Each structure stands twice: as structure tokens, then as C-alpha cells.
Amino acid sequence: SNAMHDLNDLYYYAEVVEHGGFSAAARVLGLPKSKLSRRLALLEERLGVRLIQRSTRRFAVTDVGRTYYEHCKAMIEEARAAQESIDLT
Amino acid sequence: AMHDLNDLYYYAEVVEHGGFSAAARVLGLPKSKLSRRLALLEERLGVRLIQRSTFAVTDVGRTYYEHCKAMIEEARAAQESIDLTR
Ligand SMILES: [Cl-]
Ligand SMILES: [Cl-]
Ligand SMILES: [Cl-]
Ligand SMILES: [Cl-]
């Protein structure tokens, strides 16, 4: 595996989770649902796991999906700390 | 929203390798692309990260790298949570 394939994929996944699906995430991220849906499916295929429950009425993550998200949320918090060290200037 | 997170990873490699040439080799990228990304990065940040007087990083550039390093570690931890499951 390569943890450095595309860091934006981890960003999008954590945001779709945080905002309960592609409807809010598209407007939170200023991106189309089509791109967000494709990247998350391609991220699942690279990781070789099932992060998302395709059977639920609403968006829902698997047990593995919840662990992966919390790691994604940590990475995002660091990237915001990087930007916040600049916003002090 | 946030911008391209891969640039913070590119920046850390430029710093740890001490120049665009070395970082471009291990990343599999041309120097032009690598230089294009950091130029856009310094511009949107509004601060100078790398010194141009002599390779050397600026004071705020070193502070910014410290967070990029932590960001990469958490990205590595995320993949490990998958590799452990598989
Ligand atoms: Cl890695
Ligand atoms: Cl939705
Ligand atoms: Cl940002
Ligand atoms: Cl480019």
C-alpha cells in the first residue's frame, strides 16, 4: 500500500462522513456529488476494504469505516493547524 | 474548504531532502511541477517558506513544516489502520 497516494481522498471521505452524505459535503467542499462519489468508491477500491454501507437508506460507515475516519479526522486537524500557524500573520 | 493537501506533503519532502531536485526524484515528479506547486503554496499563504538568499527554510517555513510532518504521520497512521485490517 501507499499512504501517500492522494491526501485529498482522505479529506473528502472524512467530510462526507462529517456531513451525513454527498448532499451537504458537496456544498461544504464546493465540489460535485459526482466527483465526491467517484473518489470515495475509488478510495475503497485502493484500500481494498468496505468503508460505506451501500444498503442503508442514508449514508453510513462500517466498523472499519469508523476507525479509518477517525484517523482521517486526525490528519485533517493537523492540516488545519498548519494553515492556522500562517493565519497568525 | 481546504486546498490541495498533497502540497503540504510535497513541501515536507522538499525540506527534508534540502531542495527541489532531490525531492523531485523520490516523489517521481519533475522539478517544474514541484516548483509550480510550492510557488502557488507560498502565494496563497502570503508568506515565504524557503529562503532564496542561499537550500534554507524560513522561520515561519520551519514552523509550517512541523505541522506538515505531523499531517503526514497521521496519514500514514490512517493507511496502517487499513493494512492491519487486511
Ligand atoms: Cl507511506
Ligand atoms: Cl445526503
Ligand atoms: Cl487550507
Ligand atoms: Cl501544476
CA distance linking residue A12 with residue A6, whole number of Å: 11
- The verdict on a CB contact (< 8 Å) between B75 and A10 is yes
- Phi (first) and psi of residue A43, to 5 degrees: -65, -40
- The closest alpha carbon to A12, from B4, B40, B31, B11, belongs to B4
Burial classification of residue A63, based on how many CB atoms lie within 10 Å of its CB (0-12 exposed, 13-18 middle, 19 or more buried): exposed
Strand partners, A61: A52
CA distance linking residue A14 with residue A82, whole number of Å: 18
- The verdict on a CB contact (< 8 Å) between B60 and A85 is yes
Cell of A33: 456529488
Give the resolution to one decimal, in Å: 1.8
Q: Ligand 1 centroid vs B7 CA: distance in angstroms?
A: 15
Closest-CA distance, A70 to chain B, in angstroms, reads 8
- For residue A83, give the H/E element and its range: helix A63-87
- Asked whether B38 and B7 are in contact (CB, 8 A), the reply is yes
Instruction: Return residues with CB closer than 5 A to ligand 4 (ion).
Output: B 36
B76 touches chain A (CB under 8 A): yes
Which residue has cell 460507515?
A61
| Among the partner residues B6, B67, B83, nearest to A1 by beta-carbon distance | B83
Q: Ligand 2 centroid vs B72 CA: distance in angstroms?
A: 30
